[PDB]
Design an enzyme around this catalytic site. Structure first.
Site: not given
Ligand SMILES: NC(=O)c1ccc2c(n1)-c1sccc1CCO2
Length: 327
Positions: A62, A64-69, A85, A171
């Site tokens: 699925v 998460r993060g800005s770029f779904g990365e 990431k 950021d």
């Molecule tokens: N490590 C986790 O459980 C977790 C979960 C969700 C996330 C992130 N990390 C990260 S790591 C770097 C950026 C982001 C953006 C937010 O989305």
């Protein structure tokens, strides 16, 4: 330092288990399969650690993060779950690993290692099962004041730790604050925009730099002026407004660039909800001073925000609980 050379060559071409300092030295050469894993629970196999061979992302992928990365993953040998990431090699900034490798604070998400594989740098870290503060705001609409203060307090403790070590996060926002499963512990993640500051203490928009989130940029960033740790403080107070209101500051209809308005308009202190307690409003104002020398540092603001929380009777409101309408 040419005597690194010999150590760095031994690391090159391989994935090994090792210490934080080795990862940092390897990462400096990232401008097929190599890297360092910092925890027992992620293990290379015969000099390698390869996606969908030695580690696998969760089956419905699925993002998460800005770029779904950012993905949940599992080491195949150990069974341990954590987060990865993905960063494109051609855009990778050395500071993302050199700034955070070897940090040890409960206000900072633990780094588990990093592995280069083809055109990807895969950064492994603790999976925080509470999710991000950005997801929480989205899920709940907006946060009550006591919970907002509590989390700003913790973010500021994280920033004290970084600033003391001459690290600018770059950021600070809700999306980059992660939460334990019960919501009681918050920690900073994502050092993609981090910067190592000089001994003196105190440029940004030059060289290999990648700017933060635009709605959270301090006026001096946007004006091209010299930048120091105060940039993070501005940014954390834009996060506070996002928590309280359920939307970023400066969001509202206009055509033309938002960076001009942050330069020219007064700070967004009118977005402070009128129902906030006075020390909460005062603290946000001290973090949102347009001139960095007039702005509160992390330490000062952290003390103030801890007081503000006590002034509203401490943390009383439910972890999750009830939707609150934004605007
Ligand atoms: N490590 C986790 O459980 C977790 C979960 C969700 C996330 C992130 N990390 C990260 S790591 C770097 C950026 C982001 C953006 C937010 O989305």
């Amino acid at each position: 330092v040419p005597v690194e050379e010999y150590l760095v060559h031994a690391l090159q071409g391989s994935v090994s288990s090792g210490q934080a300092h080795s990862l940092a030295s390897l990462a400096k050469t990232w401008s097929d399969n190599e890297g360092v894993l910092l925890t027992e629970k992620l293990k290379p196999v015969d000099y390698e650690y390869r996606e969908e061979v030695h580690w696998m992302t969760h089956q419905p992928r699925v993002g998460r993060g800005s770029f779904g990365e950012v993905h949940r993953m599992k080491d195949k040998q150990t069974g341990f779950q954590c987060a990865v990431k993905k960063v494109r090699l051609e855009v990778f900034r050395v500071e993302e690993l050199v700034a955070c490798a070897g940090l040890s604070s409960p206000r900072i998400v633990p780094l588990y290692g990093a592995v280069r594989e083809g055109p990807w740098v895969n950064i492994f870290m603790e999976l925080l099962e509470g999710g991000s503060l950005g997801q929480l705001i989205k899920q709940m609409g907006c946060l009550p004041e006591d919970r907002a203060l509590y989390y700003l307090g913790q973010a500021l403790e994280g920033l004290e730790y970084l600033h003391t070590r001459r690290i600018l996060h770059g950021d600070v926002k809700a999306d980059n604050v992660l939460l334990s499963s019960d919501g009681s512990r918050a920690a900073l993640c994502d050092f993609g925009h981090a910067l190592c500051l000089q001994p003196d203490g105190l440029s940004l928009l030059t060289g290999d730099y990648i700017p933060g989130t635009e709605t959270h940029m301090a006026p001096e960033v946007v004006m091209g002026k010299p930048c120091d740790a105060k940039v993070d403080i501005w940014s954390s107070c834009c996060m506070m407004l996002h928590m309280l209101n359920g939307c970023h500051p400066w969001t509202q209809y206009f055509r033309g660039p938002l960076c001009l308005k942050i330069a020219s308009e007064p700070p967004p202190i009118r977005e402070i909800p009128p129902s906030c307690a006075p020390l909460t409003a005062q603290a946000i104002q001290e973090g949102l001073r347009k001139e960095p020398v007039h702005r509160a540092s992390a330490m000062e603001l952290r003390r103030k925000v801890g007081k503000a929380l006590q002034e509203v009777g401490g943390l009383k409101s439910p972890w999750k609980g009830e939707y609150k309408e934004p605007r």
